[PDB]
Design a binder for this molecule. Structure first.
Ligand code: A1B5N
Ligand code: ZN
Length: 140
């Protein structure tokens, strides 16, 4: 579990969105595993606006933050899970790092701010859903 809180937005994995998230929906995209809902209180996270390929992510199944090198956002094949059939997920970045199913939500960050959130993984891989292209998170 985990979310990004920027301005009056809450960014979560679409497959973990709550009823309150769907009832206060701003935007969702199944192909990216992302959903954004509105919040009453203002958040403290800042979104990175960069092309960094190194950063640090939070792994809840180890209670640790790990430095990682990650790929550029791309269209990657993902294997079936309890939440999605085997399919191509867009704007996904891969890194080598421990990950387990309930780690989705953990933040990946660089020197500029939040880069994305854990969305996939397994066998020593960890996949991140990128948010750096969502410029509208910075306003209104
Ligand atoms: C972090 C982790 C570790 C091992 C496996 C995973 N996967 C395979 C997983 O639970 N899902 C559920 C939906 C997600 C997706 N974005 O398609 C894939 C994640
Ligand atoms: Zn950066």
């Amino acid at each position: 579990s985990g979310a990004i809180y920027v301005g009056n937005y809450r960014v979560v994995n679409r497959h973990l969105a709550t009823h309150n998230d769907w009832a206060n929906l701003v935007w969702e995209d199944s192909s990216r595993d992302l959903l954004v809902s509105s919040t009453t209180a203002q958040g403290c996270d800042t979104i990175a606006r960069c092309d960094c390929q190194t950063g640090v992510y939070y792994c809840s199944s180890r209670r640790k933050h790990y430095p990682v090198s990650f790929s550029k956002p791309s269209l990657i094949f993902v294997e079936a899970s309890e939440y999605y059939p085997a399919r191509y997920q867009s704007h996904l970045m891969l890194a080598v790092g421990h990950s387990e199913p309930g780690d989705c939500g953990g933040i990946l960050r660089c020197q500029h701010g939040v880069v994305g959130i854990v969305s996939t993984g397994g066998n020593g891989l960890v996949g991140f859903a990128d948010v750096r292209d969502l410029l509208w998170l910075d306003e209104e």
